[PDB]
Design a binder for this molecule. Sequence first.
Ligand code: HEC
Ligand code: HEC
Ligand code: HEC
Ligand code: HEC
Ligand code: HEC
Ligand code: HEC
Ligand code: HEC
Ligand code: HEC
Ligand code: HEC
Length: 289
Amino acid sequence: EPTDSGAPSAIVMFPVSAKPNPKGAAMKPAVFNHLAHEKKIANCETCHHTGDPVACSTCHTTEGKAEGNFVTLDRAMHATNIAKRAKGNTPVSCVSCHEQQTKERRECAGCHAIVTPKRDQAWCATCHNVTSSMTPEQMQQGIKGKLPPDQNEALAAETVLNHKPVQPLTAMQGPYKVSIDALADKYEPSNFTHRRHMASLMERIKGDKLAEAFHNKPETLCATCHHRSPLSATPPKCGSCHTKEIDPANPNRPNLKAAYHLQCMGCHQGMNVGRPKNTDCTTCHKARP
Ligand code: HEC
Ligand code: HEC
Ligand code: HEC
Ligand code: HEC
Ligand code: HEC
Ligand code: HEC
Ligand code: HEC
Ligand code: HEC
Ligand code: HEC
């Protein structure tokens, strides 16, 4: 399948710099699947914000220059907080649109209302992924904008085709139900439908390639809720980090009650759950007669 646009189906993107880089001091080049993107975004100018479709690096070099308003390659590819242009087009970055996706799509917006992205090495590597078949020489030529289109296409194509998404933990790999009773007092324990929740959440995003590329560890989705602890099938209790009472030390951290409310309710509201509403108290935990 060829692209409508006439662009290569997948493209390797290099760190175009005014500073010579004989040692290849750089991030691993990024492979952009143009075909898959263009099939999801009809407006070519959403990305090619100046109109004519040309490499962003023609204007956005690592150092920045006149043609790009000194907006560097780093900024053009990872900007967040991009201001809405009063007139004309509001450019997008790779990161901002991806971020847009998690906030605008109901199936993404529940977990992403409660997830604080790590944006660690694994996150960088999702984009910075050119096949290891790329040689230092090819790296040098791409940097100089002298890599032949056929070699670029071939490196990009190999990258796309050699990708194998990670096998996540099944909902059967987590507990079926969890009696959340760490604070049981005025109400009964909340009998959480742990497995049903996980399974419903995963089904809604099954096959999404953006989601699959960035959820790249078997337990990543478990970290949605079990955050700030090593990826694991048996994470520590919320109660191990969240104190019953506001802890006067480190710091502003929600106490346990708020941790549960903010987390459970935060997702429900993020993916517009019909029930329970945050005011449906006995739906999550029956009042104690
Ligand atoms: C896709 C959404 C990306 C993620 C996440 C990260 N980067 Fe990136 N960045 C990506 C592209 C398309 C490009 C341009 C092509 C290239 O690889 O050069 C870049 C550019 C950079 C650069 C500038 C070039 C360089 O000197 O190698 C750097 C320094 C860079 N990116 C760093 C970086 C880091 C550290 C990231 C994780 C925290 C990261 N990027 C994620 C797109 C994407
Ligand atoms: C963002 C999700 C994209 C949309 C939608 C479209 N394109 Fe694109 N294209 C974009 C990038 C990030 C790249 C790689 C540029 C790089 O630095 O290598 C491009 C590249 C092209 C090109 C090749 C430019 C060249 O290297 O000189 C062409 C001809 C092109 N794109 C055409 C094109 C058309 C017509 C679009 C709508 C059908 C379109 N693109 C949308 C990403 C984005
Ligand atoms: C030169 C003809 C351009 C090409 C090709 C690309 N960009 Fe660009 N970019 C250019 C200018 C002159 C400016 C500033 C315009 C203004 O409204 O200020 C921009 C700025 C951006 C930004 C916004 C940065 C921010 O507001 O902080 C982004 C994210 C951006 N550009 C992205 C981008 C991408 C991804 C490109 C290829 C698909 C690309 N630009 C090409 C000029 C030029
Ligand atoms: C919205 C306007 C986008 C822009 C800007 C960029 N990407 Fe993107 N990304 C977008 C969607 C909707 C998807 C899913 C496409 C589909 O098949 O469903 C993707 C996903 C990716 C992926 C994951 C899969 C793959 O192609 O490897 C990668 C790593 C990716 N996007 C990279 C990427 C880079 C490097 C970008 C700037 C050059 C970039 N994307 C911009 C939507 C948007
Ligand atoms: C809970 C079951 C999730 C759903 C459904 C979706 N995502 Fe997700 N995502 C989740 C977690 C816990 C993480 C890890 C954060 C970090 O520590 O790395 C992520 C991460 C992403 C990312 C990368 C981080 C970022 O750039 O913000 C992307 C781009 C992403 N997720 C996209 C995404 C999309 C498009 C979804 C709907 C189709 C989606 N996610 C659903 C957990 C969950
Ligand atoms: C699910 C989305 C919730 C909604 C809606 C409400 N609560 Fe909640 N609550 C939730 C959890 C998972 C827990 C932990 C239960 C425990 O035993 O560990 C709590 C806890 C409380 C508590 C403390 C425990 C108790 O006294 O038994 C209080 C008093 C409480 N919740 C009050 C409360 C009120 C009044 C709500 C409606 C306005 C309400 N909760 C909604 C989950 C959820
Ligand atoms: C939010 C939607 C969750 C996701 C996604 C996962 N889990 Fe979970 N889990 C979460 C809560 C609120 C609870 C209660 C914790 C507490 O301290 O009250 C749990 C608990 C567990 C446990 C403990 C079971 C037991 O004590 O009976 C385990 C072992 C567990 N969770 C595993 C687990 C795995 C492996 C996940 C991904 C497949 C996963 N959880 C996701 C809420 C959330
Ligand atoms: C220690 C290893 C943690 C465990 C286990 C849990 N959480 Fe946590 N969480 C912890 C920190 C250090 C922080 C504060 C971060 C900061 O910005 O101050 C929190 C924060 C929360 C919050 C607020 C929103 C957030 O940033 O994610 C909530 C809603 C929350 N935590 C909920 C929560 C739940 C329900 C837990 C068990 C499933 C849980 N946390 C465990 C660190 C620790
Ligand atoms: C998204 C990441 C969620 C988190 C965190 C929690 N819930 Fe949830 N819940 C979620 C969905 C999307 C729905 C609607 C139905 C669907 O699957 O599409 C619900 C539903 C509930 C309900 C009713 C059905 C049930 O399975 O019991 C309850 C009572 C409920 N949720 C409780 C609950 C609690 C106590 C949570 C934190 C421990 C919690 N949910 C987190 C999405 C997500």
